Design a binder for this molecule. Structure first.
Ligand SMILES: NC(=O)c1ccc[n+]([C@@H]2O[C@H](COP(=O)([O-])OP(=O)(O)OC[C@H]3O[C@@H](n4cnc5c(N)ncnc54)[C@H](OP(=O)(O)O)[C@@H]3O)[C@@H](O)[C@H]2O)c1
Ligand SMILES: NC(=O)c1ccc[n+]([C@@H]2O[C@H](COP(=O)([O-])OP(=O)(O)OC[C@H]3O[C@@H](n4cnc5c(N)ncnc54)[C@H](OP(=O)(O)O)[C@@H]3O)[C@@H](O)[C@H]2O)c1
Ligand SMILES: NC(=O)c1ccc[n+]([C@@H]2O[C@H](COP(=O)([O-])OP(=O)(O)OC[C@H]3O[C@@H](n4cnc5c(N)ncnc54)[C@H](OP(=O)(O)O)[C@@H]3O)[C@@H](O)[C@H]2O)c1
Ligand SMILES: NC(=O)c1ccc[n+]([C@@H]2O[C@H](COP(=O)([O-])OP(=O)(O)OC[C@H]3O[C@@H](n4cnc5c(N)ncnc54)[C@H](OP(=O)(O)O)[C@@H]3O)[C@@H](O)[C@H]2O)c1
Ligand SMILES: COc1ccc(-c2c(-c3ccc(F)cc3)[nH]c3nc(N)nc(N)c23)cc1
Ligand SMILES: COc1ccc(-c2c(-c3ccc(F)cc3)[nH]c3nc(N)nc(N)c23)cc1
Ligand SMILES: COc1ccc(-c2c(-c3ccc(F)cc3)[nH]c3nc(N)nc(N)c23)cc1
Ligand SMILES: COc1ccc(-c2c(-c3ccc(F)cc3)[nH]c3nc(N)nc(N)c23)cc1
Lengths: 250, 250, 251, 250
């Protein structure tokens, strides 16, 4: 019988490549999404057309609130309800926007940025662990630039630092169950086309390896390795996939 | 005219030692507290006996909620109300208890450990910046053992990692305003009186330097250094004060 | 035709497993060794029996000295001599023994610990890059998951392994324009000497959160294979811990 | 009676500022030097004029060779000869120049960059330890940009990483003797007097805190703090004194 994985924020961009690559490797997958319903549903169709009964969809807001624990439990539950098991969790979903220290409320900024990037990953991790031969693991989408943060993204960066903390703490705490917890830390990948050519190339010119952003597939490759049998002794590790961007001084 | 400082969770233990050492250095202090009313006024009493009108108390719960931003604004506001300025913020209050992955609810556990250790510091930092030959700085109380966490303290540890991220991001963004932002990372300090001499010795003997815990004063000494004119070019630095504990492998 | 790799200290233990796995992946291999000549030739024979003309040995002392640059240069040269190319360098060879701060002279200690763990890796990287000026060129340095929590009395070893982290980063940055990726793999406790005491063996096993045992050489090798592969093409400057959570365990 | 200190590369720039501060705080100093004999002897003279026989010079090449151990031992011996004791060692001397991976020979680059930045510090540490109300400590001059290194400075950068491991390894190992081992990590300080101001400003503009390099004195202030009684629980720590520079992404 095939293993199953939950991928958050999986309707597009990096989460989609991850869900696609896990599916190609043999996984059944739960495509979590928030607002991208059409793309989630359309991906589920694509994957199911390739192999029947291997993909479902689960909508949830991962903003921090008093009902976030039950939503995270719902997400993990979908995977069991559809597939009867849950082997892999990929914490990919993430809010990302500036939150200057000096038009949505600060409460909402904290809830969105800390909820998606950290608290939801923690609650999902609880629900995953609570519901457990096997190769169980969690992969958290972290950030190669966490120690050289973008100006005015303090809550995003707090969120991501907290994700590193969770990766470590859950790796220690869940190792007795044979659940590995690791991370993949992208540099720059999938530049928005909202973005100017000048600004894109300015970012591209900073990357040592190839003067280019990562493709979503390259990020997914790292995730796949971490869940694979070739990573069985690896827990609490964060693999940068940044083309050397973080090594470049100001 | 004396500078003024806010110390969070200043009624006892490390916070009190910070507030005390700041006051001796010539600062007027706002002694924030949550539950320890008696200890807080008893400290302010004592400090005011030495120097008239140089200390006030200020009660605030620093648990995360939709009113937390107003609470943190009010703490900063209290310093200005009493003293007409706010030069120094020390983020010291911290909730601390196990939150296993497998009768506080989890929503409460998230709110208290992530609110106190991270979100409240963010919001106090926002409010501090917003209100501004000065020497303005923030010092965050961090944790030297953040990369080798205690078992079943994932939320606490998430919050302490988030505080590192804030220290860095805020150091960066507030540098243009002359506000330095730094941390002190204690090891083991002030063992609970509750604990048996067995368990105390066990922690003590882990410390390479002298097999003893840090005194409150030793922690305060590092804080005072960071706020002083001797740390004028220092920003985004976190100073361990751990007697070498973080270096000791398992 | 098949790519080629140099693996230093490859006659035995972790380097042997890395050489094996690269070979099974399709690489031709230079098995470098220092004293373990019998094991090296045995290993070359066994790989060549599997695919004729795909393995050579190359003997060298990697202690620091005024001729280490020439020795490191010759190791690279011998992969070009045998196979016409050098696609992968794995810096694995390493001297490991206490050097307390309070038989061998201290100058010998310095030369061996810093030479093998850091300076030979630097010099081999230089030679590798120099000889370069359908290809996936990379270097993998065998680092150490425990470097920020060192063993007591192992200061020169630790200084070496920290230096190697630096080389990994500096070389990643500098060799990126040439398409040469540089990365690390950082074992925890792995492949315990069968010789060492069982009691001591258990002591260390018991410390590892994941499975309560040491890594197998093959587990370390898996991470090298990943980093040299086409699935790691945007990865440079990274060090992958393969430690079962050992570095996360406080005192 | 007064404590004594060995400062390596103390004839000029940051070393000199450290020697002077230490002396101003009450230390007797050994002014080590390599080529700057005029500046070394002249410093010793200015300090002795201030307090009789409180300064001596000591010349030594700290390039790695077969004689470096004896040279390092003779440096410590010079302290005991002059003052009957040696309480503090500051590892400051450092070669710094590019060594591209692609007319000194390479073995001489290795010898100088690794000798001065790591191996001499190690040997000086050994001889210091061997020779031992007491406050004994070592401050190693590290580098805040070690993880974002300058292009083509691999040997320097290796040397400075190595110096981090020494700081850690030696802290752990010498704690039982009450010898603390810490470091200070400048960003950019004391730009070359010969570098064009227009080049100098390219670096200054990178610094968040004040768009300025550190003064020699600002770096020395951190050293003074680490050697003081205010830092008696601090070992294994590296204090950045970098104005934010290492937080700035490419
Ligand atoms: N792109 C990069 O260069 C880069 C760099 C560093 C780190 N990373 C990390 O790698 C991961 C993927 O990056 P990405 O650029 O592909 O991410 P992204 O597209 O910015 O976000 C991925 C998904 O997160 C989901 N999301 C956002 N807010 C949410 C909420 N409140 N509740 C639930 N889901 C929410 C969205 O789902 P819907 O579309 O369904 O609304 C979105 O599609 C992220 O964790 C990111 O932080 C990426
Ligand atoms: N002690 C150590 O060994 C150690 C180790 C590593 C890091 N640290 C860090 O250094 C700092 C000081 O440590 P400590 O042991 O002195 O701290 P603590 O005694 O555990 O906590 C300090 C204060 O935080 C306040 N606090 C707790 N929950 C709160 C809430 N929901 N709202 C507002 N305030 C709240 C409490 O105030 P009231 O009493 O007024 O209720 C308490 O007096 C902390 O930030 C800590 O994490 C300490
Ligand atoms: N085993 C672990 O738990 C562990 C933990 C952390 C890191 N690592 C790292 O992983 C790598 C491999 O580990 P390992 O245990 O397999 O290594 P090892 O057995 O200690 O050493 C591997 C080989 O290094 C070679 N070597 C030693 N001194 C040399 C010299 N002066 N010149 C040339 N070669 C020399 C030896 O070759 P000959 O036999 O031919 O003399 C030896 O077989 C090392 O870089 C190590 O630091 C291992
Ligand atoms: N300046 C910065 O911005 C910066 C940045 C990061 C780190 N740091 C570190 O902070 C420390 C002081 O920096 P700095 O700029 O003041 O250093 P520096 O001027 O570059 O060099 C300090 C002294 O090192 C001595 N030295 C050089 N080669 C030597 C050798 N082969 N043997 C013995 N001594 C030798 C020289 O002594 P003589 O003049 O007597 O020959 C020189 O005056 C250094 O460790 C440096 O790496 C500085
Ligand atoms: C120039 O185009 C981009 C800029 C930023 C992101 C991005 C990052 C990110 C953070 C720090 C950093 F140094 C580089 C990237 N984290 C992100 N997290 C999420 N959920 N979405 C993103 N789109 C990003 C993606 C593309
Ligand atoms: C053995 O007696 C103690 C045990 C823990 C703490 C403590 C820590 C802490 C965290 C990790 C670690 F390795 C050592 C200490 N963080 C803390 N944070 C707060 N707000 N209060 C505390 N009381 C502690 C204080 C004394
Ligand atoms: C309990 O039996 C072992 C003890 C040490 C090693 C070892 C390490 C190592 C260093 C620090 C640490 F925390 C764990 C392992 N580095 C090594 N490096 C080399 N070149 N060979 C080795 N044999 C080792 C292997 C097995
Ligand atoms: C802009 O003018 C300067 C450039 C370099 C240095 C310098 C550094 C350094 C290293 C990395 C980095 F990102 C910045 C500085 N390390 C040094 N080490 C020594 N022994 N001397 C120095 N003179 C420096 C000083 C001034």
């Amino acid at each position: 019988e095939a293993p199953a994985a939950v991928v958050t924020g999986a309707a597009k961009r990096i989460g989609r490549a991850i869900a696609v690559k896990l599916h190609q490797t043999g996984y059944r997958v739960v495509i979590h999404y928030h607002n991208s319903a059409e793309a989630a549903v359309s991906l589920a169709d694509e994957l199911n057309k390739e192999r029947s009964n291997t993909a479902v969809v689960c909508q949830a807001d991962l903003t921090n609130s008093n009902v976030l624990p039950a939503s995270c439990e719902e997400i993990i539950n979908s995977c069991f309800r559809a597939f009867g098991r849950c082997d892999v969790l990929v914490n990919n979903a993430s809010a990302f926007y500036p939150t200057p220290l000096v038009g949505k409320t600060v409460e909402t900024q904290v809830a969105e940025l800390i909820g998606t990037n950290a608290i939801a990953p923690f609650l999902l991790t609880m629900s995953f662990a609570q519901r457990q031969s096997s190769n169980l693991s969690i992969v958290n989408l972290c950030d190669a630039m966490v120690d050289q943060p973008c100006m005015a993204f303090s809550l995003y960066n707090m969120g991501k630092h907290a994700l590193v903390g969770l990766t470590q703490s859950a790796a220690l705490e869940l190792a007795p169950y044979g659940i590995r917890v690791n991370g993949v830390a992208p540099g720059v990948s999938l530049l928005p086309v909202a973005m100017g050519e000048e600004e894109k190339d300015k970012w591209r010119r900073k990357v040592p390896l190839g003067r280019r952003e990562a493709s979503a597939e390259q990020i997914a490759d790292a995730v796949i390795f971490l869940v694979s049998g070739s990573a069985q002794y690896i827990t609490g590790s964060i693999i940068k996939v940044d083309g050397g961007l973080s090594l470049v001084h100001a």
